[PDB]
Amino acid sequence: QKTLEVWIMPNSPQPAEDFKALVAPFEKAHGVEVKVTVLDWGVAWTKITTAATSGVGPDLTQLGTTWVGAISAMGVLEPVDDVLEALGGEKAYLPAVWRTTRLEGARQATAVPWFSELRAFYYRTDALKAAGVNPAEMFASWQGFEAGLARLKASSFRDPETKAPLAPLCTPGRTPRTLHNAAPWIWGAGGEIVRQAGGRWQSALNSPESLEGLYFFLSLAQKGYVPAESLEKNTAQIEADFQAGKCAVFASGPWMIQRAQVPEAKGGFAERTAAKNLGVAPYPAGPKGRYTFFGGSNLALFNFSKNKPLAKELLKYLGGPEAQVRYAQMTGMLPALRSAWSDPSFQQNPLLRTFIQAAQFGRTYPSLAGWGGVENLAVQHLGMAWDLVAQGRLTREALKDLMDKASAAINQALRHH
Amino acid sequence: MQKTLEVWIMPNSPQPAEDFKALVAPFEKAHGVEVKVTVLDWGVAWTKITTAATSGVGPDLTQLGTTWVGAISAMGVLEPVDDVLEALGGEKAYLPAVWRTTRLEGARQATAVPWFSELRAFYYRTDALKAAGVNPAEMFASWQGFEAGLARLKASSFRDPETKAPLAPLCTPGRTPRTLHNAAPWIWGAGGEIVRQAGGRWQSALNSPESLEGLYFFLSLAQKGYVPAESLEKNTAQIEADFQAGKCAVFASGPWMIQRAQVPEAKGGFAERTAAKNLGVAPYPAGPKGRYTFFGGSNLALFNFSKNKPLAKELLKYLGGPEAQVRYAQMTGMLPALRSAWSDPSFQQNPLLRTFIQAAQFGRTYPSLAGWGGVENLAVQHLGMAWDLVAQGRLTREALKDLMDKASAAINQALRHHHH
Ligand SMILES: OC[C@H]1O[C@@H](O[C@@H]2[C@@H](O)[C@H](O)[C@@H](CO)O[C@H]2O)[C@H](O)[C@@H](O)[C@@H]1O
Ligand SMILES: OC[C@H]1O[C@@H](O[C@@H]2[C@@H](O)[C@H](O)[C@@H](CO)O[C@H]2O)[C@H](O)[C@@H](O)[C@@H]1O
């Protein structure tokens, strides 16, 4: 009896059950049993690299977008250009999403886009009205963003449930995901994490442009726009603070729209003032433009698979509009296939339509074999910058010295490929 | 039993399936066939069609946007239609820009039959231009006359009789998925191109001097106060609504606005509004190196897995031919793709539609590249960043050049790697 083995991460509330519901029509159509194994993200990395070196593993694995370069460069993934042609090729994806289909600069695709993580700003419509801040102006530009946070700091408005003021902005500082939160500020200033110029990749974290963007963002906590407790918190803790009426503004993904529709007893926040006064806007334009951070996850086929033709049919199914919409629903993500965004499921909620507006500006990291190493060094040095911010000690000079250290370590890492 | 044909279409007319089934009923009766129609939203149609192409399961005929013909043709899944095109009158029966959309660039054989044409020209408020002392023949003759006319429209005290407020001189979308089509005439009129052969291969020409000249000419008009910054955050339909509502002296659109001006608001038109009662149209002005009208539209293609290519070719001959051409241009608000249909009294009796036919004479399309979807995606991404600077008054020639240099690097990578 035909079987496929698929490894996935915990993408949805009941990961195995949801994936089995997702693929049931495919199973029934081709008389195949898809065997799913759920792996936490760090357990997944170990298992996948072990499969790559040993030549023993599943047919398909989920990959984070930032893992495609490293696993591709091992020479263990089957080309999937034919799958991607079936789904509509380069045209059917945002350019930032298309970049994650391959090792940077490779002719052959080795991963199929599955779902997209992207971030935009949620805001309390009641808080901004009370502060005399127009959201269209506040999220248009860095100048409007800083000016609106100042007006939010001054506002006498109190949440009608907490009976207390709102922090103007809640954001995590030091966290493993700190580079994703920084990236739109680096990019909007004209900077980069690493850039390809002069026949090689180099750190750009200590460029003038990158330092301007980083200092703009990190300095907002020192100006009193971000409360001290936000900088002691992880991504989920900040989401809870926004739901609980403690934040006027915070960056998250499309999952918060679904949560605002669901009672707290089902893991949502529909009863709370925030859910009833919810707006969303893209990140603001910097001096060199407007960018939305993209991540998410792709699917890859190991080239030692004994089931490649059937595995490619399953990749076409998972990558295709029906499954794209269903899984984006299950995960609270955006479909990776842009064709799926035309689905009435998206077109019928004005807040989700705003995420699709945000998506036009999408930007990803380069798909480098050495990406994990680059990101680790950038996270370590930005975490030291955020530690200075939590003490009110960050200067442009202190930030420059931390990014000069990151750039030296990164350039030595990039030397190794 | 009736023979069967299946056709996939997009939502081209007010009642897409019903209008198409009306259009083909005479063919059905002539050939003892039932034509099954399936309507696909424009945003899902491409993936459904490439899924059909690769699986070998689908309709007999599909609609294709003109800009899709190269990509689907290169997949090797379409049946040659040179025979059908010769039956309809051959190369001389079509405008050259329309003929170019019948095949993959450089291909030995035609794979698509022209169905209908999208083209754009400038609508203008005849009352606004009179009040501003602008002669439409001068304003729409040259880029210098166009900018001089907008300056007089900005200075004018004229108020719309209904809004009781001044009109913006020009309304245009900025960032929109269709932003390349609005830019194209300005790139072309300067002697520029989006992609052209250079050193024997297709490469970006968006960072060429001529392209940058034409783009800066057009994009800079917003910074001079001729376009409202909120226009640059609006889609194509919202801008048509602003013109109907008396907010805009001048805006580019297709021939569908002429029929809308005739019909009451209750029927989806704007006959009650000042704009409907003071409506002029002119072709795009000539640039330094020429006058060009953007052409798009849709063609019909025959999949090589069709079970009845001779009967499907009879349906392509019918849809491509004079009677059907006139009827479907009526239903859709578009221009017929077949040049002989432009002589129908339904065009020739209406002076506004006669001006679209004048505009049509300058028609120009993108090259029919296999990689076009990639090119357009990347060109839209980077023109979006340029229009975002315009909305802030921050577009310099240097900033524009840097954005087009980035666009060109990405486009050149795409063209190099395009999968066959
Ligand atoms: O860095 C590895 C990959 O991480 C993914 O982010 C996931 C996130 O979506 C999920 O909510 C949590 C649960 O732990 O894990 C995060 O780290 C990104 O989407 C990928 O781009 C990235 O490759
Ligand atoms: O990009 C694909 C094709 O788009 C057609 O334009 C249609 C337009 O006429 C219609 O108003 C809207 C509704 O969404 O869909 C547009 O994109 C063009 O005429 C083709 O040239 C192009 O290939």
Question: Which helix (H) or strand (E) element contains residue B34?
Answer: strand B33-39
Which residues of chain A neighbour B51 with C-beta distances below 8 Å?
86-88, 316, 320
Residues B319 and B197 in one domain: no
Q: Please give the Cα distance from A66 to A379 (Å, whole number).
A: 14
* Amino acid code (one letter) for A412: Q
The beta strands (E) that lie in B110-152 are given as 113-119, 121-125
Q: Are residues A108 and A130 in the same domain?
A: no
- Alpha-carbon gap: A99 to the closest alpha carbon of chain B (Å): 10
Which residue do the tokens 């120009």 mark?
B364
List, as one string, the DSSP characters of A302-331: BTT-S-HHHHHHHHHHHHSHHHHHHHHHHH
Question: Which of B75, B377, B388 is the closest to A290 by Cβ?
Answer: B388
* Residue B89, φ and ψ in degrees, nearest 5: 120, -5
Query: Domain range holding A322?
Result: 1-118+293-367
CA R_g for chain A: 22
Pairing of strands B113-119, A194-197: unpaired
Which of A233, A225, A220, A331 minimizes the C-alpha distance to A244? A233
Which residue CA neighbors atom 11 of ligand 2 most closely? B12
Beta bridge partners of B202: B197
- Cβ of B213 below 6 Å from ligand 2: no
CA distance B344 to B338: 11
Q: B3 forms bridges with which residues in the sheet?
A: B33
| Long-range CB contact pairs, A131-134, < 8 A, 24+ | A131/A155, A131/A157, A131/A248
Ligand 1 centre distance from Cα of residue A11 (Å): 9
CB count within 10 Å of CB B137 equals: 9
Tell me which chain B residues have a C-beta less than 8 angstroms from the C-beta of A335.
none
Which residues in chain A have their CB less than 8 angstroms from residue B44's CB?
321, 339-340, 342-343
Nearest Cβ partner for A86 among B54, B175, B392: B54
Which residue, by CA, sits nearest to atom 23 of ligand 2?
B65
What DSSP line would sit under A56-100, residue for residue? ---SEEEEEGGGHHHHHHTT-B---HHHHHHTTGGGGS-HHHHGG
Q: What's the CA gap between A322 and A24, in Å, rounded?
A: 13
d(CA B73, CA B67): 11
- State whether residue A227 is helix, strand or coil: coil
Among B44, B391, B417, beta carbon nearest to A342: B44
Last residue of a domain, one of B368, B387, B402: B368
Ligand 2, atom nearest to B365 Cα: 21
Residue A327 C-beta-side C-alpha neighbours within 13 Å = 30
Place of tokens 């304003």: B139
What's the rounded Cα separation, in Å, for the pair B37 and A201? 52
CB atoms within 10 A of CB A350: 10
Q: Do A198 and A316 have their domain in common?
A: no
How far from chain centre, in Å, is Cα A25? Answer: 29
What are residue B196's DSSP bridge partners? B203
Q: DSSP character for B12? A: -
How far from each other are the two terminal CA atoms of chain A, in whole angstroms? 44
Closest CA to A65 of A333, A371, A356: A371
Are A272 and A324 within one domain?
no
Residues A255 and A166 in one domain: yes
* CA A111/CA B350 separation, integer angstroms: 55
Assess whether A114 and A131 both reside in one domain.
no
**Chain A partners of B391 at a C-beta cutoff of 8 Å?**
140
Q: Which residues of B336-367 are buried (b: 16+ CB within 10 A; e: fewer)?
A: bbbbbbbebeebeeeebbebbbebbebbbbbb
Residue B86 CB neighbour total at 10 angstroms: 12
Sign of CA dihedral B360, B364, B366, B368: positive
**Alpha carbon separation from B18 to A316, B23, B37, B295 (Å, rounded):** 32, 9, 9, 27
Name which of B173, B145, B118 is nearest B293 in CA terms: B118
Q: Is any ligand 2 atom within 6 A of the Cβ of residue B118? A: yes
Number of CB atoms found within 10 A of residue A397's CB:
8
- The strand ranges marked E within A331-406 are 334-335, 362-363
Contact A400, A210 (CB under 8 A): no
CB contact under 8 A, B417 and A107: yes
Query: Sign of the CA dihedral A285, A289, A293, A294?
Result: positive
Q: Do A85 and B54 touch (CB under 8 A)?
A: yes
Residues A245 and A324 in one domain: no
Closest-CA residue, ligand 1 atom 14, reads A41
Q: Could you give the CA distance from residue A26 to residue A313 in angstroms, rounded to a whole number?
A: 9
Q: Containing H/E element for A270?
A: none
The three-state secondary structure class of B263 is coil
Rg of chain B taking only CA atoms, in angstroms:
22
Whole-angstrom distance, CA of residue B373 vs CA of residue B381: 12
- The candidate with the shortest Cα–Cα distance to B10, out of B2, B20, B22, is B20
Q: What is the rounded CA–CA span in Å between residue B193 and residue A56?
A: 51
Give the 3-state secondary structure of residue A244. Answer: coil
Round to whole Å and give the CA distance between B276 and B244.
7
Q: How buried is residue B194: exposed, middle or buried, by Cβ count under 10 Å (0-12/13-18/19+)?
A: buried
Resolution in Å, one decimal, please: 1.7
The kind and range of the H/E element at A8 are strand A2-8
State which amino acid sits at residue B365.
T
Distance CA A368, CA A413 (A): 12
Q: Are A132 and A89 in contact (CB under 8 A)?
A: no
Q: Do B253 and B280 fall within a single domain?
A: yes
Phi-psi group of A332: left, alpha or beta (phi > 0 → left; psi -120 to 50 → alpha; rest → beta): left
Report how far ligand 1's centroid is from the alpha carbon of A296 (Å): 6
For the Cβ of A100 lying below 6 angstroms from any atom of ligand 1, the answer is no
Given a contact cutoff of 8 angstroms between Cβ atoms, the answer to whether A7 and A39 are in contact is yes
Beta bridge mates, B293: B363
Instruction: Determine the atom of ligand 1 nearest the C-alpha atom of A66.
Output: 23
Q: How far is CA B255 from CA B39, B122, B353, B360, B413, in A?
A: 23, 10, 7, 11, 37
Q: Which residues of B touch A290 (CB under 8 A)?
A: 385, 388
Burial A189-206 (b: 16+ CB within 10 A, else e): bbbbbbeeeeeebbbbbb
Supply the DSSP string of B333-395, one letter for each residue. TSEESSGGGGGSHHHHTSHHHHHHHHHHTTEE-----TTHHHHHHHHHHHHHHHHHHHHHT--
B103: left (phi over 0), alpha (psi -120 to 50) or beta: beta
Instruction: Decide whether any atom of ligand 1 lies within 6 Å of the A65 Cβ.
Output: yes
* CA B166 from centroid of its chain's CA atoms: 30
**A351: amino acid identity, one letter:** L
Crossing angle of helices B372-392 and B209-223, in 10° steps, is 40
Q: Comparing C-alpha atoms, which of A281, A254, A284 is closest to residue A115?
A: A254
Phi, psi of A154 (to 5 degrees): -80, -25
Chain A residue numbers touching B71 (CB-CB < 8 A): 89, 91
**Nearest protein Cα to ligand 2, atom 19:** B297
Q: Which two tokens stand for residue A166?
A: 């709102």
Q: Which of A409, A135, A140 is closest to B233 using CA atoms?
A: A140
In angstroms, the Cα distances linking B47 to A22, A37, A299, A335, B114 are 20, 30, 19, 14, 21
Inter-residue contact B168 to B221 (CB < 8 Å): no
* B302/B401 same-domain check: no
* CA proximity to A14, closest of A343, A266, A299: A266
Cβ atoms of A372 and A193 closer than 8 Å: no
Give the C-alpha separation, A73 to B57, whole Å. Answer: 36
* Calpha distance B192→B206 (Å, rounded): 8
Among the partner-chain residues B43, B392, B410, the one whose CB lies closest to the CB of A95 is: B410
C-alpha A346 to ligand 1 mean position (Å): 23
Q: A345: CA distance to ligand 2 center in Å?
A: 22
Write the single-letter amino acid at A308: K
Residue that finishes a domain, picked among B368, B393, B411: B368
Q: Gap positions in chain A, given as the residue before each gap (C–N > 2.5 A)?
A: none
* Number of residues assigned to chain B: 420
Record the tokens describing residue B391, joined without a space.
């909305």
Q: Which of A139, A325, A342 to mutate to test the interface with B (most CBs of B within 10 A)?
A: A342
Do you know the residue count of chain A? Answer: 417
- The 3-state DSSP class for residue B192 equals coil
Are B236 and B307 members of one domain? Answer: no
Find the angle CA(A58)-CA(A60)-CA(A64) to the nearest 5 degrees.
115
Other CB atoms within a 10 A radius of the CB of residue B18 amount to: 13
Question: How far does residue B69's CA lie from ligand 2's centre (Å)?
Answer: 13
**Cβ-count burial A296-313 (b if 16+ within 10 Å, e if not):** bbbbbbbeebebbebbbb
- Check: CB of residue A220 under 8 Å from CB of residue A392: no
Contacts of A107 in chain B (CB under 8 A): 417
Cα B338 to averaged position of ligand 1 atoms, centre (Å) = 53
Task: Annotate B150-179 with three-state secondary structure.
Answer: HHHHHHCCCCCCCCCCCCEEECCCCCCCCH
For residue B168 the two structure tokens come to 């913006």
Quote the minimal CA–CA distance from B383 to chain A in Å.
Answer: 11
Query: 3-class SS at B87?
Result: helix
| Strands laid side by side in the A247-252 sheet | A167-169, A247-252, A120-124, A278-281
Asked whether the beta carbons of A102 and A109 are under 8 A apart, the reply is yes
Number of domains observed in the structure of chain A: 2
Strand residue runs (E) in A271-405: 278-281, 292-301, 334-335, 362-363
Contact A341 B47 (CB under 8 A): no
If asked whether residues B192 and B252 sit together in one domain, one would say yes
| Interaxial angle between packed helices A208-222 and A178-188, expressed in degrees from 0 to 180 and rounded to the nearest 10 | 120
Closest to A281 (Cα-Cα) out of A250, A302, A305? A250
Kind and range of the H or E run holding B232: none
C-alpha A318 – ligand 1 centre gap (Å) = 19
Q: Which residue of A has its CA nearest to B233?
A: A357
Q: Which chain A residues are within 8 Å of B376, Cβ to Cβ?
A: 91
Residues 6+ apart with CB under 8 A from B33: B2, B3, B4, B5, B27, B311
C-alpha distance from A414 to closest chain B C-alpha (Å)? 22
Tell whether the torsion through CA atoms of B61, B67, B69 and B71 is positive or negative: negative
**CB neighbour list of residue A222: distance below 8 Å, 6 or more residues apart:** A389, A392, A394
Residue nearest to atom 12 of ligand 2 (CA): B42
- Could you tell me if A292 and A359 are in contact, meaning their C-beta atoms sit under 8 angstroms apart? yes
Cβ neighbours around A417 below 10 Å, total: 12
CA dist B48 and B66 (Å) reads 17
> Token pair of B156, please?
């004018």
Give the Cα separation of A325 and A318 in Å (integer). 10
Substitution site in A40, A66, A180, A367 for ligand 1 pocket (most atoms within 8 Å of beta carbon): A66
Q: How far apart are CA A64 and CA A75, in angstroms?
A: 17
Residues B153 and B273 in one domain: yes
Q: Hey, which residues does B38 pair with through a beta bridge? A: B8
| Ligand 2 centroid from CA B286, angstroms | 25
Rounded CA separation B232/B238 (Å): 11
